[PDB]
Amino acid sequence: LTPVTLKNGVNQLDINQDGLKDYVVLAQFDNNTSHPNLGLTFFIHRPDGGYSIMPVTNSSEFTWFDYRLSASADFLVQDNRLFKIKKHYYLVTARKTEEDLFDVGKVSLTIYRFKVSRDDPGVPLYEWSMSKTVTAQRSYQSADEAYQEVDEAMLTR
Amino acid sequence: LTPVTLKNGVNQLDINQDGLKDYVVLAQFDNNTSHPNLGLTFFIHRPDGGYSIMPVTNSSEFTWFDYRLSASADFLVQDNRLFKIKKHYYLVTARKTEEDLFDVGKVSLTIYRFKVSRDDPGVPLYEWSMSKTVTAQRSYQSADEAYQEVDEAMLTRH
Ligand code: NA
Ligand code: NA
């Protein structure tokens, strides 16, 4: 188990383990605040030379953004982070789940697998598909603190 | 006007023309239909080394997609294309404007120019800002056909 660090911009990773390097692009949306929201955009390299942009699950968006409560305090309400076991990549969303998002609180970790669907019309060819949601053991100020609990048994089924 | 030649994937182009290469990513949304939806995603290189993802104007999205009337249609209702005049880049959206999208019809061309809005409250730092919309002078089956009318005079403000 490795959490996967990402460089600003293009990261060449082989998310679907087929020998062609894909892109994970790490960028931020700058709309002029102290803590711009970082977003991840996934592009799967196709053998025909095209790049297939992956959707956000349960969304019409194609970039996975972090979320912060307002312009102001330095903590995350929602975060995303990539993990890898051997050749397999997993995307994990950490989210503060209590009503008072400002306080130290419970955090849910949603584990997504890479899923290829080749088959049903109108379904994405390449998507992140939920495998497991767990509640972190500790309460935290910032969602990203929960990733310190992620281990091999939590990612796999 | 010949459009900007994009390769599939990352195109390293200096969109705001400040000397730092930015990314224009050409990709497709594959959703088990007869046609992929082609999309452009823009990332502006910042001095601190970060990349700033540009929003789609008047939208919650961050990729500019082409659009068809239905899964199997062999024409576009909406397209986007990059052009360049001297050092400036212009994003041009072609859209079929009539309710009856299936028939040959009027197409609009919305020209966007690059705009920086620095330290301005809650406004995107980097955006495509509408310069002008023009109605193409011929009616077309597919919106991308109207790019044949694009020229220097259409693109630049002065
Ligand atoms: Na790959
Ligand atoms: Na630039």
Q: Do A60 and B63 touch (CB under 8 A)?
A: no
Contacts of B33 in chain A (CB under 8 A): 121-122
Q: Using an 8 Å Cβ cutoff, are A25 and A40 in contact? A: yes
Rg from Cα positions in chain A:
16
A91 — phi, psi (to 5°)? -105, 135
**Nearest-angstrom CA–CA distance, B83 and B153:** 12
Q: Which residues of B60-77 are buried (b: 16+ CB within 10 A; e: fewer)?
A: ebbbbbbebeeeeeebbb
Question: Which residue, among B139, B153, B128, has the nearest Cα to B61 in the 3D structure?
Answer: B128
Q: Which one of A8, A23, A50 has the shortest CB-CB distance to B51?
A: A8
Q: Do B122 and A33 touch (CB under 8 A)?
A: yes
Contacts of B45 in chain A (CB under 8 A): 9
How many Cβ atoms sit within 10 Å of the Cβ of residue B55? 18
**Nearest-angstrom CA–CA distance, A108 and A130:** 13
Resolution in angstroms, to 1 decimal, for this deposition?
1.8
List the strands of the sheet with A78-85, edge to edge.
A2-3, A78-85, A88-96, A107-116, A126-135
Residue B35, C-beta contacts closer than 8 angstroms, at least 6 positions apart = B68, B71, B72, B73, B74
Number of domains in chain B: 1
| DSSP at B105 | B
**Nearest-angstrom CA–CA distance, A81 and B54:** 22
CA B5 vs. chain centroid, Å, equals 13
**Nearest-angstrom CA–CA distance, B157 and B111:** 10
- Under the phi-then-psi rule, with left for phi > 0, alpha for psi from -120 to 50, and beta for the rest, what region is B137? alpha
Question: Which residue, among A60, A55, A9, A21, has the nearest Cα to B43 in the 3D structure?
Answer: A9
User: From A28, which residue of chain B is nearest by alpha-carbon distance?
Assistant: B52
Interface residue B110 vs chain A (CB under 8 A):
no
Domain that holds residue A111: 1-157
Residues in chain A: 157
Q: Using an 8 Å Cβ cutoff, are B61 and B39 in contact? A: no
Residue A43 to chain B, least CA–CA distance (Å) = 7
Q: Which residues pair with A28 in a beta bridge?
A: A38, B52
Q: Do B53 and A125 touch (CB under 8 A)?
A: no
